[PDB]
Design a binder for this molecule. Structure first.
Ligand SMILES: *[C@@H]1O[C@H](CO)[C@@H](O[C@@H]2O[C@H](CO)[C@@H](O[C@@H]3O[C@H](CO)[C@@H](O)[C@H](O)[C@H]3NC(C)=O)[C@H](O)[C@H]2NC(C)=O)[C@H](O)[C@H]1NC(C)=O
Ligand SMILES: *[C@@H]1O[C@H](CO)[C@@H](O[C@@H]2O[C@H](CO)[C@@H](O[C@@H]3O[C@H](CO)[C@@H](O)[C@H](O)[C@@H]3O)[C@H](O)[C@H]2NC(C)=O)[C@H](O)[C@H]1NC(C)=O
Ligand SMILES: *[C@@H]1O[C@H](CO)[C@@H](O[C@@H]2O[C@H](CO)[C@@H](O[C@@H]3O[C@H](CO)[C@@H](O)[C@H](O)[C@@H]3O)[C@H](O)[C@H]2NC(C)=O)[C@H](O)[C@H]1NC(C)=O
Ligand SMILES: *[C@@H]1O[C@H](CO)[C@@H](O[C@@H]2O[C@H](CO)[C@@H](O)[C@H](O)[C@H]2NC(C)=O)[C@H](O)[C@H]1NC(C)=O
Ligand SMILES: *[C@@H]1O[C@H](CO)[C@@H](O[C@@H]2O[C@H](CO)[C@@H](O)[C@H](O)[C@H]2NC(C)=O)[C@H](O)[C@H]1NC(C)=O
Ligand SMILES: *[C@@H]1O[C@H](CO)[C@@H](O[C@@H]2O[C@H](CO)[C@@H](O)[C@H](O)[C@H]2NC(C)=O)[C@H](O)[C@H]1NC(C)=O
Ligand SMILES: *[C@@H]1O[C@H](CO)[C@@H](O)[C@H](O)[C@H]1NC(C)=O
Ligand SMILES: *[C@@H]1O[C@H](CO)[C@@H](O)[C@H](O)[C@H]1NC(C)=O
Ligand SMILES: *[C@@H]1O[C@H](CO)[C@@H](O)[C@H](O)[C@H]1NC(C)=O
Ligand SMILES: *[C@@H]1O[C@H](CO)[C@@H](O)[C@H](O)[C@H]1NC(C)=O
Ligand SMILES: *[C@@H]1O[C@H](CO)[C@@H](O)[C@H](O)[C@H]1NC(C)=O
Ligand SMILES: *[C@@H]1O[C@H](CO)[C@@H](O)[C@H](O)[C@H]1NC(C)=O
Ligand SMILES: *[C@@H]1O[C@H](CO)[C@@H](O)[C@H](O)[C@H]1NC(C)=O
Ligand SMILES: [Ca+2]
Ligand SMILES: [Ca+2]
Lengths: 48, 973
């Protein structure tokens, strides 16, 4: 939330559900990264 | 340097040589005599300027009465028929039979859509419609993203199917009536006569974006003018997708505004400011809307939201009254995402009386609270909208007109006033049209006052198209010289009628394209803007013209004679001309009509040839078989009558005219007798001139071609071989040299076009023309203009015989008024004849302009074809420079300098012509050259838009408009 919260403001129409905008969504994203499924997409979103 | 005496002698001898050549070869005196010799085959009739404008205004008003009577009929029938609808939801058993436009015409389509049945029309080809139409029914257009066959659409189709009878009745009552359309509030458009859509949905690669609710006629008929303020949230939270969505939404919302609305775009993030250089409401025309769009596409998101400051800014902007406004619909159109502050105290302080509406938009996908903006919406009599994606923009930025129409509906029959739009290009490729509109009200349970729930909204807008060619048919121009003309203006400055109005769209700024980001198969939108050209932008602007336009805007009638500057048909010369403007108001509407007449065109010629053999011989004079005896003949493609059509090919049109005149007697039971008689008289007089004078001297040294162009549509060029070199328009009224000769009272030299495909330099010659003036009972008339194509080689032999061929000591050139080179002395400049002299010797030209021998002014052409820049052809603005003589002195002697350099010059104006002779020290003596002086169409972007808003042109708004009805419900957001 500190690092990526409110920073996914991309000027495109792509949908990025796995973000860190609030606590439940950040918790879901962290759980998804722990499961290892599509974590690289989250990393790419954080890098961009 | 030679003394002034010898230069004066040389220029004198040259001028008498040229004048004698032109006078003795063209034959002005012989033509004048043969016009005066007969004096009985024709009569001189006055052009009563005061009366003609009155008849034309009455004709225009009565045509608009035609069109208005057909609108009230349709509106009443639509109201009555929809008042008796049942609103069923079972259409499978009872199919709805209609002809859908933009569908394949193949008989094997077999759509068989549930609840609908299609119609296959015959589609005969008919005139007054440049396409194939069917009068057996009406066509229906439905937007591509709107599903046909839904309950709402299918219910509209039957109750609108009763409009076909009234469509047919209106057509049969007035056969010359164009499109009749009903644009529904559900998106449908039912128009008559039936015709396939210009751009079908997806049968080819191209697609159409046509929603009837966004058309200017529908928008003007759906609500009253507005004082709009777009408030944009640029705080930090709107960063990302919602910011681009807001930008697109604001551009689309600006696209819904017309010239009678006033808009300004503000922006707030913990501080409120303006997005552009306007600082107050502006007229919201094409230029101002372009500026606002450019400013909106340039904003960024940063800061903390503060609704109080933004709303305070919006209310202070709406409370200005220091500037021109509409004073009708004060609305704040707030684009945002979501918040937690509703700013009740600001609304209590500024909008206690609820005189200002608020429409709120929540844009994008976000988790922010939407309650406060809904409260803002349906607390201040406004509305609330959600725009989650691009595809939801267009529909959601046009529904605010439904709310604005509630007071108009509640006003009742007082709100059914026929309105007319600006000039715009028809969507069905018909040209420039104006549409008369009339709203249609939903009256269900009106006699009992039962529901009154959806009856506050309109069913749609009825419209009838009127083509500008229909209006031009009520203002004939062939009884006046090619210099006079009609023109009509709005109470807004825009011209409904003008010779300089063209079907091209109005350009704004420099056209910049980026072809590196355009896919080949994306089908970008083309345009939807109207052709709004101001009166002052259609002609050269004086101070007298401004006051004339102001006096004629606010419904006044009068006349004014003065002296003005007139630009030529080719944007190269400017003449000083006597003019008289006579203007009157059209009683039924807000248009004002004026007639422009020069002093010499107060009388015209009416032919009195009545007996047979004279007309027969005058008719056989113009036949190709004896052109060798009477020179190549050109005939103006005028509407002599509807049997023969203009062809744009002069040979075939002349053959058709000749065979039509031979086939039936000139009694003309159903053809314009005046035009034909005038043409025959002109042909006879011109043939007499050619046979009696020109044929006597079969070939003479100096000339290449001798031509005569007369008022009536006869052009004759004596050498047939020179006929192929004749590139002039066969229509006399569209010849630049003809009008230039009419304006001037001397011989006029026309510079050939330089560096263009076609023989125009040596094979043709230099054109010199003079107008024929006659006096019958002391009344001046200018019926014809004669002219000569002087050979370049013989003129060179005249010229050389210090000015010697390829001399390295002197420069000897001849220019015309306008600074175009006709002859030089070095045979090097002679290769470029007709080039602007400021482009080969810019220093001397600049100094000549400085010493006030060549005046110039610049104008803006707002409809120009333009090669797109980098940042095939688009529309933009160009700047045109025109040069002319201002100071009446004859000889100017001086010396130009360049920095430790000096060149002596002497220029002399030739008598009885428009020519100047220049002798100067050679340009190669000292190498001084700063920049080229270009006289050409220069693509531009000015004038500065937010400098014209500080002092704008005079304007009149609509007198009556509807707002703030106490019976309004407004319980919907
Ligand atoms: C510049 O070129 C001109 C043509 O290219 C020359 O113009 C011709 O000059 C002739 C002699 O001056 C004229 O001849 C006489 O002209 C008048 C006309 O009626 C009369 O004096 C005589 O009838 C006639 N002589 C004849 C016919 O033998 C030509 O008429 C005249 N051309 C035209 C069309 O009028 C200029 O001479 C020439 N300039 C110089 C300096 O040579
Ligand atoms: C929309 O569709 C409906 C149904 O197709 C139309 O209603 C139909 O109207 C016709 C003529 O008005 C009716 O025909 C008449 O039927 C009566 C018997 O009911 C008969 O005695 C008459 O001689 C005549 O044939 C038809 O019955 C009626 N259908 C239904 C289901 O009511 C409706 O008119 C259409 N909308 C508009 C605006 O016309
Ligand atoms: C003009 O206004 C009238 C009412 O003032 C509109 O008629 C009303 O239309 C609505 C739907 O738009 C009807 O509601 C529907 O009723 C059916 C039952 O018949 C129901 O099954 C639907 O779910 C829906 O609720 C309403 O009954 C109807 N009222 C009357 C008195 O006809 C009319 O639609 C308006 N005109 C246009 C072009 O919209
Ligand atoms: C334009 O609006 C301004 C408001 O800023 C008006 O200026 C005020 O006018 C009142 C009335 O005379 C004065 O009492 C104030 O002192 C003025 N304020 C300022 C800052 O000048 C102005 O009158 C309006 N009209 C014009 C033509 O400027
Ligand atoms: C309709 O237009 C005509 C223009 O011919 C107006 O007629 C003139 O109106 C003025 C002012 O009312 C009078 O002084 C003239 O005497 C009228 N001329 C004639 C020949 O009648 C007429 O007024 C217009 N209609 C209305 C209702 O104003
Ligand atoms: C068109 O050219 C004329 C030149 O005659 C310009 O008229 C002059 O304008 C200057 C500049 O203001 C004045 O000082 C002169 O007094 C004007 N002369 C006359 C005779 O009126 C005119 O301004 C030009 N038109 C435009 C639109 O610039
Ligand atoms: C207006 O309508 C009437 C009646 O149909 C017709 O006689 C008249 O010619 C129309 N006006 C014009 C300008 O066509
Ligand atoms: C507007 O756009 C121009 C680019 O043409 C840019 O230079 C300018 O900074 C922009 N304005 C703002 C306020 O960012
Ligand atoms: C134009 O007006 C002036 C001034 O009244 C007059 O002298 C002249 O004859 C008129 N016609 C012209 C210049 O053709
Ligand atoms: C105009 O002249 C220049 C050089 O004099 C030449 O390069 C150019 O092609 C010419 N324009 C046309 C249209 O031929
Ligand atoms: C051009 O004309 C202006 C007119 O005020 C004058 O001041 C200036 O000196 C002139 N240019 C030159 C080079 O003399
Ligand atoms: C033309 O110029 C001369 C000298 O420059 C001057 O005396 C004369 O008044 C001018 N004529 C005008 C301005 O009409
Ligand atoms: C004018 O002065 C410059 C600088 O002193 C010099 O280079 C140039 O040659 C001079 N011009 C002539 C014609 O001598
Ligand atoms: Ca995986
Ligand atoms: Ca915010």
């Amino acid at each position: 939330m500190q690092l990526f919260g409110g920073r996914y403001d991309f000027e495109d129409t792509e949908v990025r559900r796995s973000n860190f905008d609030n606590f439940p969504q950040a918790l879901i994203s962290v759980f998804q990264v722990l499961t290892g499924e599509d974590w690289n997409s989250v990393m790419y979103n954080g890098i961009m | 340097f030679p003394s002034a005496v010898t230069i004066k002698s040389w220029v004198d001898k040259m001028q008498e040589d040229l004048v004698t050549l032109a006078k003795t070869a063209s034959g002005v005196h012989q033509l004048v005599d043969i016009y005066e010799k007969y004096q009985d085959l024709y009569t001189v009739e006055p052009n009563n300027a005061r009366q003609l404008v009155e008849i034309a205004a009455r004709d225009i008003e009565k045509l608009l009465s035609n069109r208005s009577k057909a609108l009230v009929r349709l509106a009443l029938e639509a109201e009555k028929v929809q008042a008796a609808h049942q609103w069923r939801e079972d259409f499978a058993s009872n199919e709805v039979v209609y002809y859908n436009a933009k569908d394949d015409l193949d008989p094997e389509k077999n759509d068989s859509e549930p609840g609908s049945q299609r119609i296959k029309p015959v589609f005969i080809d008919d005139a007054n419609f440049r396409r194939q139409v069917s009068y057996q029914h009406a066509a229906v257009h439905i937007p591509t993203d709107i599903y046909e066959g839904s309950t709402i659409v299918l219910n509209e189709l039957n109750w609108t199917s009763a409009l076909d009878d009234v469509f047919k009745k209106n057509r049969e009552e007035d056969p010359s009536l164009l499109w009749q359309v009903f644009g529904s509030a559900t998106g449908l458009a039912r128009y008559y006569p039936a015709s396939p859509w210009v751009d079908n949905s997806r049968t080819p690669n191209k697609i159409d974006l046509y929603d009837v609710r966004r058309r200017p006629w529908y928008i003007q008929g759906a609500a009253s003018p507005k004082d709009m303020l777009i408030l944009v949230d640029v705080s930090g939270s709107v960063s990302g997708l919602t910011l681009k969505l807001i930008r697109t939404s604001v551009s689309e919302m600006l696209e819904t505004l017309s010239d009678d609305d006033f808009v300004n775009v503000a922006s707030f993030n913990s501080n409120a400011q303006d997005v552009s250089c306007f600082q107050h409401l502006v007229q919201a025309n094409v230029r101002n809307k372009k500026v606002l769009k450019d400013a909106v596409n340039n904003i960024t998101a940063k800061g903390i939201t503060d609704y109080k400051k933004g709303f305070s800014f919006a209310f202070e902007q709406l409370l200005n009254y220091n500037v021109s406004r509409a004073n009708c619909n004060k609305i704040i159109m707030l684009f945002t995402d979501g918040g937690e502050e509703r700013a009740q105290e600001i609304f209590a302080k500024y909008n206690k009386d609820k005189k200002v509406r608020v429409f709120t938009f929540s844009v994008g996908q976000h988790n922010y609270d939407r309650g406060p903006i809904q409260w803002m919406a349906c607390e201040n009599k406004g509305y609330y909208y959600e725009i989650p994606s691009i595809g939801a923009i267009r529909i959601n930025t046009q529904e605010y007109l439904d709310v604005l129409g509630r007071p108009m509906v509640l006003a009742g029959d007082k709100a059914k006033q026929v309105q007319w739009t600006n000039v715009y290009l028809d969507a069905l490729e018909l040209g420039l049209v104006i549409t008369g509109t009339l709203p249609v009200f939903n009256i269900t349970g009106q006699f009992e006052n039962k529901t009154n729930l959806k009856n506050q909204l309109i069913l749609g807008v009825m419209g009838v198209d009127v083509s500008l060619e229909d209006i031009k048919r009520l203002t004939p121009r062939f009884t006046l010289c090619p210099n006079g003309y009609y023109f009509a203006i709005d109470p807004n400055g825009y011209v409904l009628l003008h010779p300089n109005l063209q079907p091209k769209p109005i350009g704004v700024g420099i056209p910049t394209i980026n072809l590196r980001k355009r896919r080949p198969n994306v089908q970008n939108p083309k345009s939807q803007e109207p052709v709004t050209l101001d009166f002052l932008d259609a002609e050269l602007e004086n101070d007298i013209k401004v006051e004339i336009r102001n006096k004629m805007i606010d419904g006044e009638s009068g006349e004014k004679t003065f002296r003005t500057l007139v630009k030529s048909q080719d944007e190269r010369y400017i003449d000083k001309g006597n003019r008289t403007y006579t203007w009157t108001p059209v009683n039924g509407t807000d248009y004002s009509l004026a007639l422009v007449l020069p002093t010499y065109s107060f009388y015209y010629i009416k032919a009195k040839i009545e007996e047979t053999i004279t007309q027969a011989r005058y008719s056989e004079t113009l036949k190709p078989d004896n052109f060798e005896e009477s020179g190549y003949t050109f005939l103006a493609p005028r509407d002599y009558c509807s049997d023969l059509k203009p062809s744009d090919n002069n040979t075939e049109f002349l053959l058709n005219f000749n065979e039509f005149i031979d086939r039936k007697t000139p009694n003309n039971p159903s053809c314009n007798t005046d035009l034909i008689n005038r043409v025959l008289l002109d042909a006879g007089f011109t043939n007499e001139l050619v046979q009696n004078y020109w044929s006597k001297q079969k070939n003479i040294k100096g000339v290449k071609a001798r031509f005569v162009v007369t008022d009536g549509g006869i052009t004759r060029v004596y050498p047939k071989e020179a006929g192929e070199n004749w590139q002039e328009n066969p229509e006399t009224y569209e010849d630049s040299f003809y009008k230039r000769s009419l304006d001037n009272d001397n011989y006029v030299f026309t510079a050939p076009y330089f560096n263009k495909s076609g023989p125009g330099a040596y094979e043709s010659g230099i054109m010199v023309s003079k107008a024929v003036e006659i006096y019958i009972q002391g009344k001046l008339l200018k019926p014809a203009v004669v002219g000569i194509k002087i050979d370049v080689n013989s003129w060179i032999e005249n010229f050389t015989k210090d000015c010697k061929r390829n001399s390295d000591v002197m420069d000897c050139v001849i220019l015309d008024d306008g600074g175009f080179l006709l002859m030089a002395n070095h045979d090097d400049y002679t290769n470029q004849i007709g080039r602007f002299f400021g482009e080969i010797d810019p220093s001397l030209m600049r100094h000549l302009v400085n010493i006030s021998v060549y005046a110039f002014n610049k104008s803006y052409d707002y409809q120009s074809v333009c090669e797109p820049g980098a940042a095939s052809k688009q529309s933009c603005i160009t700047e045109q420079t025109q040069y002319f003589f201002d100071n009446d002195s004859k000889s100017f002697s001086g010396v130009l300098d360049c920095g430790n350099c000096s060149r002596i010059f002497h220029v002399e104006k030739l008598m009885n012509t428009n020519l100047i002779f220049i002798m100067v020290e050679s340009k190669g003596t000292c190498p001084c050259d700063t920049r080229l002086l270009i006289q050409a169409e220069q693509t531009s972007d000015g004038p500065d838009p937010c400098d014209m808003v500080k002092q704008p042109r005079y304007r009149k708004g609509p007198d009556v408009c509807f707002d703030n009805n106490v019976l309004e419900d407004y319980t919907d957001c």
